[PDB]
Amino acid sequence: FNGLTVLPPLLTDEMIAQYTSALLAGTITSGWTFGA
Amino acid sequence: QCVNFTTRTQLPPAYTNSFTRGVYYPDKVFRSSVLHSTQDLFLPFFSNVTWFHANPVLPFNDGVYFASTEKSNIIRGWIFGTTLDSKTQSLLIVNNATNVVIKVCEFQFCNDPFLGVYYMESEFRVYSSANNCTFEYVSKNLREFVFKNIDGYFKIYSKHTPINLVRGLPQGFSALEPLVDLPIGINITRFQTLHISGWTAGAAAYYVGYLQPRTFLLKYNENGTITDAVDCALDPLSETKCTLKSFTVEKGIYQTSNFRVQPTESIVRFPNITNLCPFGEVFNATRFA
Amino acid sequence: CGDSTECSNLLLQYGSFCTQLNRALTGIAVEQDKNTQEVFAQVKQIYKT
Amino acid sequence: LTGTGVLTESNKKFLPFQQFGRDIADTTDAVRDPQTLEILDITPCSFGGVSVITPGTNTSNQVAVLYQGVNCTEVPVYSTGSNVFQTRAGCLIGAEHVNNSYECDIPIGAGICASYQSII
Amino acid sequence: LTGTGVLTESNKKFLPFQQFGRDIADTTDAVRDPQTLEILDITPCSFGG
Amino acid sequence: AEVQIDRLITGRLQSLQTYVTQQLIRAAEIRASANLAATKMSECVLGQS
Amino acid sequence: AEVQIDRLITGRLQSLQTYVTQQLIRAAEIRASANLAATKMSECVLGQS
Ligand SMILES: *[C@@H]1O[C@H](CO)[C@@H](O[C@@H]2O[C@H](CO)[C@@H](O)[C@H](O)[C@H]2NC(C)=O)[C@H](O)[C@H]1NC(C)=O
Ligand SMILES: *[C@@H]1O[C@H](CO)[C@@H](O[C@@H]2O[C@H](CO)[C@@H](O)[C@H](O)[C@H]2NC(C)=O)[C@H](O)[C@H]1NC(C)=O
Ligand SMILES: *[C@@H]1O[C@H](CO)[C@@H](O[C@@H]2O[C@H](CO)[C@@H](O)[C@H](O)[C@H]2NC(C)=O)[C@H](O)[C@H]1NC(C)=O
Ligand SMILES: *[C@@H]1O[C@H](CO)[C@@H](O[C@@H]2O[C@H](CO)[C@@H](O)[C@H](O)[C@H]2NC(C)=O)[C@H](O)[C@H]1NC(C)=O
Numbered sequence: 001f002n003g004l005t006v007l008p009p010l011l012t013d014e015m016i017a018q019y020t021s022a023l024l025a026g027t028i029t030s031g032w033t034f035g036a
Numbered sequence: 037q038c039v040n041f042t043t044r045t046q047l048p049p050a051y052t053n054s055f056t057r058g059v060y061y062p063d064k065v066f067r068s069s070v071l072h073s074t075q076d077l078f079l080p081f082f083s084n085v086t087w088f089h090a091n092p093v094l095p096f097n098d099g100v101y102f103a104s105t106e107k108s109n110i111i112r113g114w115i116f117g118t119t120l121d122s123k124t125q126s127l128l129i130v131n132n133a134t135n136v137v138i139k140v141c142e143f144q145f146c147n148d149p150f151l152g153v154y155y156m157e158s159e160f161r162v163y164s165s166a167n168n169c170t171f172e173y174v175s176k177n178l179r180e181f182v183f184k185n186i187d188g189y190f191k192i193y194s195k196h197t198p199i200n201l202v203r204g205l206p207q208g209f210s211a212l213e214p215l216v217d218l219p220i221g222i223n224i225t226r227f228q229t230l231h232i233s234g235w236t237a238g239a240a241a242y243y244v245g246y247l248q249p250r251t252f253l254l255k256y257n258e259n260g261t262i263t264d265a266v267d268c269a270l271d272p273l274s275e276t277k278c279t280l281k282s283f284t285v286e287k288g289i290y291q292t293s294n295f296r297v298q299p300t301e302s303i304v305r306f307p308n309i310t311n312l313c314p315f316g317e318v319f320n321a322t323r324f325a
Numbered sequence: 326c327g328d329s330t331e332c333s334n335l336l337l338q339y340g341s342f343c344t345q346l347n348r349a350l351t352g353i354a355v356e357q358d359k360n361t362q363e364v365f366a367q368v369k370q371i372y373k374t
Numbered sequence: 375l376t377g378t379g380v381l382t383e384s385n386k387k388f389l390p391f392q393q394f395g396r397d398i399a400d401t402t403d404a405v406r407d408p409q410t411l412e413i414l415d416i417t418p419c420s421f422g423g424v425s426v427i428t429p430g431t432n433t434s435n436q437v438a439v440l441y442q443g444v445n446c447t448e449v450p451v452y453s454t455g456s457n458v459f460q461t462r463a464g465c466l467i468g469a470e471h472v473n474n475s476y477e478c479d480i481p482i483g484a485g486i487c488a489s490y491q492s493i494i
Numbered sequence: 495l496t497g498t499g500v501l502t503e504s505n506k507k508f509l510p511f512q513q514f515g516r517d518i519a520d521t522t523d524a525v526r527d528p529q530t531l532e533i534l535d536i537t538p539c540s541f542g543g
Numbered sequence: 544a545e546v547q548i549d550r551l552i553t554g555r556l557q558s559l560q561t562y563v564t565q566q567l568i569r570a571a572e573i574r575a576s577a578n579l580a581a582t583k584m585s586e587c588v589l590g591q592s
Numbered sequence: 593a594e595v596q597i598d599r600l601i602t603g604r605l606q607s608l609q610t611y612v613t614q615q616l617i618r619a620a621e622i623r624a625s626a627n628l629a630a631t632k633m634s635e636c637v638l639g640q641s
């Protein structure tokens with residue numbers, strides 16, 4: 001490092017995986033009705 | 037015309053919080069409803085002051101916030117200079133009913149310099165000798181003053197404010213206005229207060245302070261009178277106000293500055309010693325030629 | 326500058342060039358976070374199979 | 375070989391004739407001392423920005439200071455303040471950890487964010 | 495105070511020690527005449543494409 | 544030495560500004576892509592297109 | 593005076609160029625937003641989407 005820095009993303013990969021899992025389980029069981 | 041004295045009225049210096057006093061108008065420009073961020077020699081917020089009560093000699097350094105409490109025009113005299121003698125140019129100030137009296141030259145101060153009052157008052161015996169000089173100038177209650185000296189200019193600000201509480205400094209804000217300027221500069225290092233009248237005065241409470249370079253954030257009202265000020269390098273809250281240039285800060289996260297760990301010492305090295313010169317034979321030869 | 330005093334003083338008189346640079350980069354980072362949040366956080370609850 | 379940083383203990387291997395390594399873009403990364411012929415390494419001492427978490431000037435006037443991406447070993451007026459906390463984002467000084475779960479008010483980073491009750 | 499423009503009559507009040515006002519970004523907007531001591535104004539004479 | 548530091552400062556400022564500009568352009572491209580992805584998620588996942 | 597004025601001109605030219613570039617970027621983003629707004633007006637207001 002030479003004065004340049006990288007900042008971590010606010011959402012960790014585990015939470016993103018949780019979002020995707022929730023979306024996918026909802027669309028498996030409910031269909032599209034859970035978007036309205 | 038002065039003598040020595042016996043009753044050494046030496047008292048220890050008590051201490052008290054400085055609070056938010058010592059704000060003056062830096063520039064003579066008019067402004068309206070703006071927050072002009074400026075940096076200058078100020079009295080930092082929330083310090084403690086070398087309170088006094090014969091009268092000791094104090095260093096000048098950058099500046100002095102020479103405040104003073106009084107009833108009916110008590111404090112009169114001021115002596116400034118480097119050596120305080122006739123060898124080096126000295127400065128004398130006398131305040132009175134009118135604005136200002138100033139003399140600028142070498143004098144002869146003894147161990148007991150005082151103006152003296154006669155009871156219809158006429159007495160002047162602070163020094164004894166005055167060889168030569170050129171410049172002279174003529175023009176319950178807390179009397180705040182400031183004494184700056186920058187690049188050959190001597191500046192005196194002032195303010196008068198009624199007070200009711202006995203001991204502590206007021207928890208209020210009052211800016212200082214520019215009063216007197218002189219285009220003369222001397223490398224002043226010390227100053228002293230003058231005593232009034234043998235002298236009989238022990239209840240002369242004058243505070244002292246010191247000024248440092250830093251940055252503030254003044255707020256001018258619609259009439260151009262300073263009514264607020266926010267120090268910058270005080271706490272991790274005022275820094276946000278300084279960097280946002282606003283007095284109210286919304287809920288959130290703001291980046292103020294950055295830090296770096298500093299180096300501690302040096303460990304300079306060198307190649308390991310090898311191949312000593314054959315000076316042993318030369319310096320310890322069996323026989324020199 | 327890289328830990329020097331004279332360089333800082335010389336750069337000081339160049340006006341305020343760093344402030345808007347940091348402003349732009351901060352805007353970029355906030356934009357990245359907003360992008361991710363709006364792409365993924367399309368739902369309110371957390372369902373389970 | 376002028377340079378600043380910390381000199382930990384390295385576990386690499388130098389052939390008997392090198393003197394100092396480097397990694398990429400001409401940055402020194404290891405030195406063998408000229409006397410004991412052992413290899414140390416160099417890591418520049420840390421830096422980083424700071425940030426202030428405030429709940430609103432009107433509501434309160436106490437803040438929490440975040441030191442981004444810095445180990446909570448050499449932080450040092452807020453040298454102690456409140457219970458110092460360590461997180462992937464950095465060292466948080468002035469707020470205390472809570473092992474419950476709420477929504478998010480002020481995104482801090484790395485999967486954590488703070489709010490106002492003190493400051494949690 | 496070298497500058498060009500038109501000088502009109504104003505109503506702003508100066509404390510007895512200021513000389514000239516300004517609004518923002520270091521732009522003179524008022525001035526007190528050094529002889530009669532009244533509050534004038536300043537506006538650069540107009541330009542345009 | 545002041546002149547030499549001036550040269551260094553000018554060069555490094557130019558490089559930094561160019562880097563920031565490229566970052567801005569690529570960020571705009573990525574934002575367009577993210578908007579497209581959000582539209583696809585809202586239209587193809589949460590319903591039949 | 594030639595050298596000093598050249599320095600002033602170069603600095604002000606750099607600042608003006610940066611300002612123009614930022615204006616161009618912001619204009620592009622605003623135009624994208626305006627296209628989105630026109631689409632929304634033409635699809636939701638003038639018919640069921
Ligand atoms: C009057 O007193 C002043 C103060 O000592 C003397 O003036 C100094 O003269 C030297 C030599 O030119 C200068 O370097 C100093 O700056 C002067 N100081 C001041 C305060 O003026 C001066 O010699 C004395 N005599 C006369 C006739 O002026
Ligand atoms: C700023 O100064 C002006 C100049 O006098 C003040 O204007 C008037 O002041 C008198 C004296 O108190 C009031 O009776 C008037 O009502 C004021 N008129 C207006 C239009 O303000 C003004 O009050 C001063 N501003 C402040 C905040 O004190
Ligand atoms: C520099 O070289 C000298 C001689 O080669 C080293 O001296 C020997 O070091 C070993 C290892 O510590 C000791 O066991 C010997 O007793 C030392 N002998 C003498 C005569 O000094 C020396 O150690 C080297 N420098 C360093 C820092 O290791
Ligand atoms: C902050 O620094 C300390 C040491 O200064 C780190 O603690 C070391 O951790 C390693 C690996 O867990 C151990 O092998 C050392 O023995 C520890 N040293 C001490 C003195 O405890 C700590 O891990 C660092 N923090 C982070 C987040 O890396």
Ligand SMILES: *[C@@H]1O[C@H](CO)[C@@H](O[C@@H]2O[C@H](CO)[C@@H](O)[C@H](O)[C@H]2NC(C)=O)[C@H](O)[C@H]1NC(C)=O
Pocket residue numbers: 529530531
């Ligand atoms: C400025 O000098 C002139 C010289 O007379 C004066 O200004 C005006 O003088 C007339 C008389 O011709 C008076 O009626 C005015 O009242 C004066 N104006 C002012 C503002 O005073 C006056 O002596 C000086 N004005 C000053 C010092 O303000």
Ligand SMILES: *[C@@H]1O[C@H](CO)[C@@H](O)[C@H](O)[C@H]1NC(C)=O
Pocket residue numbers: 051084085
């Ligand atoms: C300020 O207060 C502290 C503690 O009250 C005291 O030790 C110190 O001498 C005072 N003065 C200064 C200049 O710190």
Ligand SMILES: *[C@@H]1O[C@H](CO)[C@@H](O)[C@H](O)[C@H]1NC(C)=O
Pocket residue numbers: 132133134136137174175
């Ligand atoms: C105050 O000092 C000034 C200047 O020396 C003088 O003109 C005035 O008469 C003095 N007034 C009193 C009351 O001493």
Ligand SMILES: *[C@@H]1O[C@H](CO)[C@@H](O)[C@H](O)[C@H]1NC(C)=O
Pocket residue numbers: 221222223
């Ligand atoms: C102040 O000190 C400087 C030191 O260089 C000297 O040249 C100057 O004459 C001094 N001024 C006074 C008034 O003593």
Ligand SMILES: *[C@@H]1O[C@H](CO)[C@@H](O)[C@H](O)[C@H]1NC(C)=O
Pocket residue numbers: 315316317319320
């Ligand atoms: C010479 O011999 C003397 C006697 O022991 C000794 O003290 C000195 O260090 C020797 N010097 C050299 C250069 O060998």
Ligand SMILES: *[C@@H]1O[C@H](CO)[C@@H](O)[C@H](O)[C@H]1NC(C)=O
Pocket residue numbers: 430432433434
């Ligand atoms: C600011 O805080 C005060 C006290 O907490 C509250 O009364 C006020 O409504 C708040 N203002 C805003 C805009 O939230």
Ligand SMILES: *[C@@H]1O[C@H](CO)[C@@H](O)[C@H](O)[C@H]1NC(C)=O
Pocket residue numbers: 471472473
């Ligand atoms: C963290 O969780 C543990 C349970 O393992 C609990 O005992 C502890 O109180 C929690 N921390 C706080 C600050 O509540």
